[PDB]
From a paper:
We have been focusing on the design and synthesis of non-peptidyl PIs that are active against HIV-1 variants highly resistant to the currently approved PIs. In the present work, we designed, synthesized, and identified two novel PIs, GRL-09510 and -09610, which contain a unique polycyclic crown-THF (Crwn-THF) as the P2 moiety and a sulfonamide isostere. GRL-09510, which contains a newly-generated polycyclic non-peptide P2-crown-tetrahydrofuranylurethane (Crwn-THF) and a sulfonamide isostere, potently suppressed the replication of wild-type HIV-1 and HIV-2 with favorable EC50 values.
The structural analysis using the X-ray crystallographic data of PR complexed with GRL-09510 showed that the P2-Crwn-THF of GRL-09510 forms a strong hydrogen-bond network with the backbone atoms of Asp 29 and Asp 30. In addition, as illustrated in Fig. 3c, the Crwn-THF forms greater VdW and hydrophobic contacts with multiple amino acids in the active site of PR than the bis-THF moiety of DRV. The two strong CH–O bonds between the Crwn-THF and the backbone carbonyl oxygen atom of G48 with the interatomic distances of 2.4 Å and 2.6 Å should also be responsible for the observed potent activity of GRL-09510 against HIV-1WT and various drug-resistant HIV-1 variants. The Cβ, Cγ and Cδ atoms of Ile47 (located in the highly flexible flap domain of the protease) are engaged in multiple Van der Waals interactions with the P2-Crwn-THF moiety of GRL-09510. The P2-mono-THF (of APV) or P2-bis-THF (of DRV) due to smaller size compared to P2-Crwn-THF may not retain their contacts with Val47 generated by the I47V substitution. Thus, the P2-Crwn-THF moiety of GRL-09510 perhaps not only contributes to the enthalpic component of binding via H-bonds with Asp29 and Asp30 (as seen with DRV) but also contributes to the entropic component via Van der Waals interactions with Ile47 as well as Val47 (I47V) due to its increased size. Thr91 is located in the helical domain of the protease, adjacent to Trp6′, and is engaged in multiple polar contacts with Asn88, Arg87 (directly) and Asp29 (indirectly). The T91A substitution may induce structural distortion in the helix generating a conformational “ripple effect” that may destabilize the H-bonds between P2-Crwn-THF moiety of GRL-09510 and the backbone of Asp29.
Residue numbers in the entry:
A (entry chain A), B (entry chain A): 1 to 99
The structure:
């Protein structure tokens, strides 16, 4: 689908058996989700945004469905104020920007 | 132009007579630029991102050229780590997202 930007580009995602809403975010290199339960082993990592930094947990090779499209990749979990789908997953579902 | 997302979607902007690079950011409601000199009166405002909050200066009806396209709108200036073009300006240049 094509989406204009008069509203936030929110989509439905499915990850770890659960349904959530997330923001398609061309401004984000990586994917960052609010606190949630994931299966498996993770790695401690710190990332930075507009107001400073947060500690996240890094999960690799995680299956995630984004607006119907399946992708496997790294997902960071930590105290972000919103679920963000970043470029590491956007390239996998073939998202482009038109200006 | 259409742009894929294997790299950051950076474009050239011109604002207040100066040339800068900025990120086309569908995840940002508003436009936030690093500290720079602008002409005119502004308003004190605070905005929030992944690691917390920052104080910005809000400039209205500012002329800004984004990748060749002229737009007039609100620009926030403050200690963001990167120049961000948000949805308030992206709609004006007709940017869309395709997934
Ligand atoms: C390497 O991996 C990553 C992944 C993500 C991030 S990030 O989240 O910091 N970011 C990067 C951006 C260059 C600042 C993406 C934006 O799209 C955020 C995403 C985000 C949205 C909402 C809340 C928190 C984060 N936009 C936002 O800060 O905008 C505010 C300010 C700009 O306009 C408005 O829209 C959202 C708020 C608000 C004021 C950093 C590193």
């Amino acid at each position: 689908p094509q989406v204009t930007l008069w509203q936030r580009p929110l989509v439905t995602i499915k990850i770890g058996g659960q349904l959530k809403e997330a923001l398609l975010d061309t401004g984000a290199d990586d994917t960052v989700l609010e606190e949630m339960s994931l299966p498996g082993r993770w790695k401690p990592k710190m990332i930075g945004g507009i107001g400073g930094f947060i500690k996240v947990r890094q999960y690799d090779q995680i299956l995630i469905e984004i607006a119907g499209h399946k992708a496997i990749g790294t997902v960071l979990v930590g105290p972000t104020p919103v679920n963000i789908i970043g470029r590491n997953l956007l390239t996998q579902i073939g998202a482009t920007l038109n200006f």
